[PDB]
Design an enzyme around this catalytic site. Structure first.
Site, PDB file in Angstrom:
ATOM      1  N   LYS A 157      26.885 -37.876   5.155  1.00 10.10           N
ATOM      2  CA  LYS A 157      27.007 -36.518   5.674  1.00 10.10           C
ATOM      3  C   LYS A 157      28.427 -35.998   5.511  1.00 10.10           C
ATOM      4  O   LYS A 157      28.640 -34.799   5.303  1.00 10.10           O
ATOM      5  CB  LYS A 157      26.583 -36.483   7.142  1.00 10.10           C
ATOM      6  CG  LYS A 157      26.504 -35.104   7.770  1.00 10.10           C
ATOM      7  CD  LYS A 157      26.911 -35.163   9.235  1.00 10.10           C
ATOM      8  CE  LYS A 157      26.924 -33.786   9.870  1.00 10.10           C
ATOM      9  NZ  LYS A 157      25.616 -33.095   9.718  1.00 10.10           N
ATOM     10  N   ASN A 183      -8.521   0.788   5.136  1.00  6.48           N
ATOM     11  CA  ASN A 183      -8.816   0.722   3.710  1.00  6.48           C
ATOM     12  C   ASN A 183      -8.167  -0.496   3.074  1.00  6.48           C
ATOM     13  O   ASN A 183      -8.591  -0.941   2.002  1.00  6.48           O
ATOM     14  CB  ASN A 183      -8.368   1.998   3.005  1.00  6.48           C
ATOM     15  CG  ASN A 183      -6.879   2.052   2.781  1.00  6.48           C
ATOM     16  OD1 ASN A 183      -6.094   2.012   3.724  1.00  6.48           O
ATOM     17  ND2 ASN A 183      -6.479   2.157   1.523  1.00  6.48           N
ATOM     18  N   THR A 222      -2.972   1.353  -4.174  1.00  2.23           N
ATOM     19  CA  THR A 222      -3.203   2.534  -3.364  1.00  2.23           C
ATOM     20  C   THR A 222      -4.532   3.190  -3.707  1.00  2.23           C
ATOM     21  O   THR A 222      -4.978   3.186  -4.854  1.00  2.23           O
ATOM     22  CB  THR A 222      -2.069   3.548  -3.531  1.00  2.23           C
ATOM     23  OG1 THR A 222      -2.430   4.774  -2.885  1.00  2.23           O
ATOM     24  CG2 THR A 222      -1.769   3.809  -4.996  1.00  2.23           C
ATOM     25  N   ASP A 262       0.906  -1.125   0.000  1.00  5.39           N
ATOM     26  CA  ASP A 262       0.000   0.000   0.000  1.00  5.39           C
ATOM     27  C   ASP A 262       0.984   1.223   0.000  1.00  5.39           C
ATOM     28  O   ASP A 262       2.152   1.061   0.334  1.00  5.39           O
ATOM     29  CB  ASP A 262      -0.941  -0.077   1.216  1.00  5.39           C
ATOM     30  CG  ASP A 262      -1.535   1.232   1.696  1.00  5.39           C
ATOM     31  OD1 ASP A 262      -2.346   1.820   0.945  1.00  5.39           O
ATOM     32  OD2 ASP A 262      -1.162   1.612   2.821  1.00  5.39           O
TER      33      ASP A 262
HETATM   34 MG    MG Z   1      -2.098   3.200   3.764  1.00 10.82          MG
END
Ligand code: MG
Ligand SMILES: *[C@@H]1O[C@H](CO)[C@@H](O[C@@H]2O[C@H](CO)[C@@H](O[C@@H]3O[C@H](CO)[C@@H](O)[C@H](O[C@@H]4O[C@H](CO)[C@@H](O)[C@H](O)[C@@H]4O)[C@@H]3O)[C@H](O)[C@H]2NC(C)=O)[C@H](O)[C@H]1NC(C)=O
Ligand code: PSF
Ligand SMILES: *[C@@H]1O[C@H](CO)[C@@H](O[C@@H]2O[C@H](CO)[C@@H](O)[C@H](O)[C@H]2NC(C)=O)[C@H](O)[C@H]1NC(C)=O
Ligand code: NAG
Lengths: 1112, 337
Positions: A1043, A776, A654, A379
């Protein structure tokens, strides 16, 4: 519709609305049983052993006793329920600090604002919100302290927009400004239903026999923050989980991690070894008991039917072989996942010292998904940016001035066009000289910085002045202007005054007219009468609008200004060209008459005032340009560069505008110079399908090099993204998004941020991360594989609902590259060991069926085998997955391309699962064949001729299979701390002390009665102590050689212009070379028209709080 | 207030050791192993070749042995290991009595003085003591001595627990299928050779002589198992009732075996040493091999530190020390190439 009465709480609770609390927790008291059982039965080991424990209940079938596997299943289902409850308690008290926050609530019996909590807010309750305080519910304001009852809200949690939005209370309700007159409100409020539509609302308030038509200009939402005003007196409407931003936020969903989906395939790959070995052992029982029926007459076998005791012995081998599937695998990996989340949340490099906030992992089922991330969905506002703007530099008269010069960009010889940087003290020395000719044009430039705005100044109690701007761009021009002198001090309803610094003079400018910023205008202007009497027009805006309105007869700084804009936008700054014209006295009165008839026109004034404004803005003189820096968070450009080297593809989703996200992408180095923008801005659903097909007809006609795909970037508007997620168009979008380096999506809704993550999730097998802040992007976090939230910065709501809550964006580097790649590599080894550990023990039951005529007799005791999964081999699965760093934390940060080892899944597959199960078969055949050659007739003891029985040999098989599987974990592990010494050789010493105590106490309680003489004839015998130190060395001699061979040898790691001339001819493709980056954050709903007319700064405050009258 | 502490345990920087795998590190590990396993490995082989034994498969004694004189046993039925060389092969004959029950008399030579303790076992092959129907088939309370009634008997001793509305007292498949061949408790010396008495006391385990107690049944509600009905033809009375506390041949049989080839102890003599002589063992033949389909033998071992003549543990110590002395040299082979 919803009906809300004003000032009677008893009548507004009978409708039964929700309260103000929100629930973050995964389950309540009611839904703990179905949600925890569905989470555990979706694991296939816990579903198999639920069926096994019912097969033990039909009589005479089980070789062990009937309570053996239901006692182990109730233990692991209780330890798994304890890990769940101590996370959902930590999810409930961190949820409690939100509900117990301060909120002034009017009490009608008290008639004053008493302090209460958020959770005591009922619907219909008039509250009071102070300055810089979050709004606690969906509220309609009634009055406020500002003129005509207005306020400003910040909506950086409602969407990503970084400006301020004016909310104006109604004129019929703005008189209620006192607390004592707040008891006369009587009526109802008819509202709408909760609908999660952020920018629309309709309501109707009947307050004292009068209708009030409400509006979204009168409604403030819950995620918003009240700013630049003292107080408001709004009543709430929606609250809790019926607010417009938290409707679709649900409880924490069950997120099945990708490793747990691989275990469910290796359990199906273990049923096909189970069903084969039951069928081998049950057709040999039918063959032997019917061929040798005359030689087994001492068993008194029935011989009822060949299909009757086929099934009765089908279930016996089902029970005897049931522990091939590990019963303690899922609750072991749950406590490795729980304790790794504890060590993530205890790191100091993931702790933010400024806010005193450590990182917390709420959903700890997803610690190992952080090592397989292939797409990060970020975002912008608040996550990438700090939401602070500062005046960085300015270009005037063909010269640039900056705070401190980066020395490589200094004043050099020009190409005819001057480039470089000077300091601001040289701006001061060029201003105070009347001999330099730039000093008149510097003077009207700095006054344009301190007049043309709509900022309202408020003097504090000290000499400090606070600038109150709607748009943060023009708020930084006044503050950055005033640091160069010419401080803006007070504002009158018809004038502003500017305080000059070095002389102390306070010049006063009459504000005549102002012209609003508009997204179609991309400029704003204002006309000022000077104290000389000569009026003057000022203007600021975009170069693609300003340059069409100039005088080429006058100014010579234009091609010097445009080259400074290209130097600014490549650095990432937000630019703005500044122009003016000296309008004389006579030219004004014929224009103001044209302006007044446009303004007094009631309708269609939105598009006629600018058509009256361009009649005066035609002949301007370009003074120069400014550059404002939107502050990113610290370590954002270095994190994005490091995560892109690790193979992760960064996307930006965004809610902000498009011109800001391109600027932030240019600043955080997502986008770059020498890069093309595949812009998709279309208005209909058929216009974007042309645009998606016109690009894929052009950029995949020839195969692209990996250098040239780093010159492509996708930018799509949120309206076009709503059409490019129609299911016919979902694959044209991912075809161009997968060939671009960076994807930016602008002005996307909260729901569209989830539908993008839900589209990459079901069209690929890649794991997705979504980081954000505010409500949001809360639906983006529920919809991702891992959801990360940014922690408390006065607006936390994503960090509550997230799986991890980090302090800032720069912590994503160490969380993924170090704690993520450790948690995937350690858990993948701790699961392949727990599959091996139940195969090296319980396959001796299978080789025993050839030596007991396929009857199914248990080689070991019934309760001794349950202690194998619970006490003696449960610690080396834990400590391998927790305290064993396979590679250094200093090496994982330095070389980020080591992250791709976890992305391909090289450590944890189903093919490499077969190298451990076959290693479990080979180790089980050495214990069996090794302990039947010793103890041949039972004649292995030296105790006066006594012989070892069936149960003294079964303890030697159990103990040898413990030293084998602990000696394997001592070779598997990479790093030997002191917590491995209590696990790997300390669970051998545990069993060698537990066994003489268990078998000398419990047989006398009629529990495990096969051990009455075993301790003397095992521990007192010399053949038992010599068996334990030669058979584990015999069976691990291949694991010590492989190993050693793996360490020394066999190592693993832990035509340019033919396309670039073709891609530009597509419809909306722009390149980042000579883009002159303009950005202005003002909006049309910001109310910059009348707030300059309503404020008198010299007028002081009223008696009812900080209330100021409308001085217009 | 919320800052986590900077201890080395919370910050994932604990003091740790990483294994250096190198031909200078794991080389003195492989030499210390193959220098301490070879005195152990040959010490378990030199102890297993000091065990002296004799195994006579008397399975076909009721068919392949004449009832008149001492013929020789076929060498497919004879295994023996002694210190000194034998001179005469063992001999064998059948002998019926006035009742008509056969007896197998085995004569053998023991070529040297055996100065350890002498233990008499019988070896049974192809008998599944470890069958799942067989291991759990006895009653624990009846062995302790409690007079359990009918419907609270252990239901795992299901085909043999109740014949004619009665209680089979040692219920189960284990006690019903008990080995019936009675070894004579003396090795009779033939000519110029003394006898050798063999005790049948302290034969079972020490925890078995405690938990096997005499019954508190009263011999009127209990019936023998159906394969014991030749020793108890009329049934159980108060006189002939077996005392399983001192019946130490019965306690050895109930302690079940792991594999279908097993030994069971019958006789021992810790007090003295038998000298070289011609001895005779008489075996009352009551157990037919057609019941299970394998062979039955007669064993005369002595004990070693790891049991008897079993070379498997000493070889397992030399395969491991052979690999740890092989790859202590092949470190130097691939390095130079
Ligand atoms: Mg934000
Ligand atoms: C040592 O152990 C030997 C094997 O355990 C055992 O040999 C078995 O002995 C039993 C008991 O005599 C034999 O069972 C007989 O079965 C035949 C039928 O084939 C019957 O004549 C008789 O059963 C009768 O059944 C009636 C009702 O069913 C019952 O009322 C009668 O009383 C009667 O019991 C016998 O019981 C069995 O065949 C023998 N052989 C095998 C291979 O099992 C030896 O006798 C035993 N020796 C000693 C000295 O204890
Ligand atoms: C004798 C049959 C053994 C049973 C078969 C068996 O175990 O094969 C699987 C192994 C896988 O290797 P590890 O299980 O040691 O793990 C390896 C991991 N990458 C680590 O680093 O430890 O393959 C070999 O070693 C191949 C050599 C075969 C040589 C015969
Ligand atoms: C172990 O065997 C020896 C024989 O070598 C037994 O010793 C003889 O016991 C009898 C008892 O009837 C005496 O008459 C002999 O005089 C003893 N001989 C010697 C040389 O001591 C010894 O009793 C046996 N141990 C037992 C039966 O527990
Ligand atoms: C020793 O053997 C002889 C030979 O039959 C026997 O008579 C005597 O009872 C035995 N001694 C003991 C103590 O049993």
């Amino acid at each position: 519709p919803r009906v809300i009465h004003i000032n009677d709480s008893l009548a507004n609770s009978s409708f039964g609305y929700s309260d103000n609390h929100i629930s973050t927790t995964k389950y309540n008291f009611a839904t703990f049983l179905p949600k925890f059982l569905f989470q555990e039965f979706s694991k296939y080991a816990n579903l198999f052993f639920l069926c096994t424990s019912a097969i033990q209940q039909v009589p005479h079938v089980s070789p062990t006793n009937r309570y053996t596997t239901i006692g182990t299943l109730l233990v692991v289902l209780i330890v798994s329920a304890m890990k769940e409850c101590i996370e959902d308690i930590k999810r409930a008290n961190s949820d409690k600090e939100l509900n117990n926050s301060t909120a002034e609530i009017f009490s009608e019996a008290h008639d004053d604002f008493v302090e209460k909590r958020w959770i005591d807010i009922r619907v219909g309750d008039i509250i009071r919100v102070k300055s810089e305080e979050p709004i606690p519910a969906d509220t309609i304001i009634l009055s406020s302290s500002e003129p005509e009852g207005l306020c400003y809200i910040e909506t950086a949690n409602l969407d990503g927009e970084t400006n301020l939005k004016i909310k104006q209370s109604r004129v019929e309700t703005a008189k209620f400004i006192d607390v004592k007159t707040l008891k006369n409100m009587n009526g109802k409020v008819v509202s709408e239903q909760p609908n999660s539509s952020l920018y629309t609302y309709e309501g109707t308030m009947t307050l004292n026999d009068r209708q009030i038509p409400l509006s979204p200009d009168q409604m403030i939402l819950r995620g918003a923050t009240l700013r630049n005003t003292a107080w408001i007196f709004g009543l709430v409407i929606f609250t809790g989980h019926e607010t417009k931003l938290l409707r679709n936020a649900t409880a924490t969903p069950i997120k099945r991690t990708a490793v747990e989906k691989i275990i469910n395939r290796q359990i199906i790959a273990l049923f096909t070894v189970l069903i084969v070995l039951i069928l081998i052992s049950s057709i040999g029982n039918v063959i032997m008991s019917t061929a040798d029926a005359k030689h087994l007459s001492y068993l008194y076998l029935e011989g009822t039917n060949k299909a009757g005791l086929f099934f009765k012995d089908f279930l016996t081998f089902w029970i005897l072989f049931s522990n091939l599937v590990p019963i303690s695998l899922f609750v072991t990996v749950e406590l490795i996942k729980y304790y790794q989340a504890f060590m993530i949340g205890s790191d100091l490099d993931l702790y933010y010292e400024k806010t005193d906030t450590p990182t917390v992992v709420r959903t700890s089922s997803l610690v190992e998904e952080l090592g397989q991330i292939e797409y990060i969905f970020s975002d912008k506002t608040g996550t990438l940016t700090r939401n602070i703007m500062e005046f960085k530099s300015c270009s005037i008269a063909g010269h640039c001035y900056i705070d401190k010069i980066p020395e490589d960009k200094t004043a050099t010889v020009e190409d005819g066009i001057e480039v470089g940087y000077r300091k601001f003290d040289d701006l001061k020395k060029k201003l105070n000289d009347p001999s330099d000719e730039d000093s008149p044009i510097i003077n009207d430039f700095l006054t344009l910085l301190a007049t043309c705005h709509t900022v309202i100044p408020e003097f504090q109690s000290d000499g400090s002045i606070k600038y109150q701007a709607a748009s943060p761009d023009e708020g930084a021009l006044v503050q950055g202007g005033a640091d160069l002198g010419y401080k803006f001090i007070i504002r009158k309803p018809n004038s502003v005054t500017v305080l000059l610094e070095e002389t102390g003079e306070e010049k006063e400018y009459q504000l005549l007219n102002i012209c609003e910023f508009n997204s179609t205008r991309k400029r704003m202007s204002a006309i000022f009468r000077f104290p000389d009497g000569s009026i003057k027009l000022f203007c600021k805006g975009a170069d693609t609008v300003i340059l069409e309105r100039l005088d080429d007869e006058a100014n010579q700084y234009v091609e010097a200004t445009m080259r400074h804009l290209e130097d600014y936008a490549s650095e990432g700054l937000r630019t703005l060209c500044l122009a003016m014209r000296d309008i004389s006295e006579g030219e004004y009165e014929e224009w103001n008459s044209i302006y007044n008839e446009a303004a007094t026109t009631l309708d269609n004034r939105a598009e006629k005032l600018d058509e009256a404004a361009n009649l005066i803005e035609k002949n301007l003189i370009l003074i120069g340009a400014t550059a404002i820096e939107d502050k990113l968070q610290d370590g954002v450009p270095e994190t994005i560069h490091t995560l892109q080297e690790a193979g992760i593809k960064i996307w930006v989703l965004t809610g902000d505008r498009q011109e800001t996200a391109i600027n932030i992408g240019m600043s955080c180095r997502l986008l770059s110079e020498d890069m093309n923008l595949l812009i998709i801005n279309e208005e209909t659903r058929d216009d974007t399908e042309r645009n998606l097909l016109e690009k894929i007809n052009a950029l995949n006609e020839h195969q692209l090099s990996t250098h040239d795909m780093n010159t492509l970037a996708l930018v799509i508007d949120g309206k076009s993204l709503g059409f490019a997620l129609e299911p016919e168009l979902e694959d044209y979008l991912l075809t161009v998004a997968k060939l671009c380096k960076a994807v930016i999506c602008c002005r996307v809704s909260p729901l569209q941020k989830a539908l993008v993550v839900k589209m990459v999730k079901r069209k690929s097998s890649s794991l997705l991360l979504a980081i954000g802040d505010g409500a949001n992007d809360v639906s983006m976090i529920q919809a991702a594989h891992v959801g990360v939230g940014i922690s408390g910065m006065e607006g936390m709501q994503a960090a509550r609902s997230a799986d991890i809550a980090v302090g800032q964006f720069k912590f994503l580097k160490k969380l993924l590259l170090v704690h993520g790649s450790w948690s995937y590599q350690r858990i993948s080894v701790a699961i392949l060991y727990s599959f091996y550990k139940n195969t090296a023990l319980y396959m001796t039951q299978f080789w025993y069926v050839f030596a007991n005529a396929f009857s199914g007799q248990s080689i070991m005791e019934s309760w001794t085998m349950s202690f194998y999964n619970l006490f003696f081999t449960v610690w080396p699965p834990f400590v391998i997955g927790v305290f064993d760093q396979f590679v250094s934390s200093r090496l994982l940060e330095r070389y980020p391309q080591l992250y791709k080892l976890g992305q391909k899944g090289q450590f944890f597959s189903v093919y490499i699962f077969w190298g451990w199960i076959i290693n479990g078969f080979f180790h089980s055949a050495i214990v069996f064949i090794g302990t039947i050659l010793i103890y041949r007739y039972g004649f292995a003891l030296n105790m006066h001729g006594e012989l070892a029985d069936h149960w003294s040999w079964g303890v030697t098989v159990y103990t040898t299979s413990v030293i084998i599987v602990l000696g394997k974990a001592a070779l598997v592990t990479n790093q030997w701390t002191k917590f491995t010494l209590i696990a790997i050789p300390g669970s051998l010493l545990f069993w060698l002390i537990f066994f003489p105590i268990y078998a000398s106490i419990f047989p006398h309680a009629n529990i495990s009665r096969e051990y009455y003489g075993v301790v003397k004839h095992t521990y007192g015998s010399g053949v038992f102590w010599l068996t334990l130190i030669v058979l584990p060395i015999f069976a691990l001699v291949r694991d010590f050689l492989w190993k050693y061979y793996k360490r020394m040898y066999e190592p693993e790691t832990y035509h340019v212009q033919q396309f670039q001339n073709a891609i530009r001819k597509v419809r909306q493709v722009q390149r980042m070379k000579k883009q002159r980056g303009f950005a202005f954050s003002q909006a049309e709903e910001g109310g910059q028209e009348k707030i300059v007319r309503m404020y008198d700064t010299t007028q002081k405050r009223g008696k009812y709080g900080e209330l100021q009258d409308a001085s217009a | 207030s919320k800052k986590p502490p900077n201890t080395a345990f919370r910050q994932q920087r604990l003091k740790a050791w990483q294994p250096i795998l190198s031909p200078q590190s794991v080389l003195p590990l492989l030499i210390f192993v193959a220098c301490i396993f070879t005195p152990i490995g040959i010490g378990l082989i030199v102890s297993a070749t000091k065990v002296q034994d004799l195994t006579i498969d008397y399975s076909h004694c009721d068919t392949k042995a004449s009832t008149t004189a001492f013929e020789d046993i076929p060498k497919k039925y004879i295994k023996y290991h002694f210190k000194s060389k034998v001179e005469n092969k063992p001999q064998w004959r059948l002998t019926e009595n006035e009742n008509g029950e056969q007896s197998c008399e085995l004569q053998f030579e023991i070529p040297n003085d055996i100065k350890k303790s002498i233990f008499i076992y019988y070896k049974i092959t192809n008998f599944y003591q470890n069958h799942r129907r067989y291991v759990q088939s006895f009653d624990t309370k009846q062995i302790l001595g409690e007079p359990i009634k009918k419907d609270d008997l252990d239901t795992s001793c299901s085909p043999i627990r109740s014949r004619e509305d009665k209680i089979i007292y040692p219920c189960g498949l284990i006690a019903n299928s008990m080995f019936n061949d009675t070894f004579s408790q003396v090795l009779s010396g033939i000519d110029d050779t003394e006898d050798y008495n063999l005790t049948n006391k302290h034969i079972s385990w020490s925890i078995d002589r405690h938990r096997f107690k005499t019954t508190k049944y009263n011999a009127s509600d209990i019936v023998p198992p159906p394969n014991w009905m030749k020793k108890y033809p009329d049934g159980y009375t108060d006189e002939n009732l077996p005392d399983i506390h001192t019946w130490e041949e019965f306690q050895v049989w109930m302690r079940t075996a792991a594999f279908p080839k097993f030994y069971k102890l019958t006789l021992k003599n810790e007090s003295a040493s038998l000298p070289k002589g011609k001895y005779q063992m008489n075996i009352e033949l009551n157990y037919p091999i057609s019941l299970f389909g394998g062979t039955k033998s007669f064993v005369l071992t002595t004990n070693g530190a790891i049991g008897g003549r079993n070379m498997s543990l000493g070889v397992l110590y030399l395969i491991v020390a052979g690999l740890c002395a092989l790859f202590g040299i092949i470190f130097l082979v691939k390095l130079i190439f």
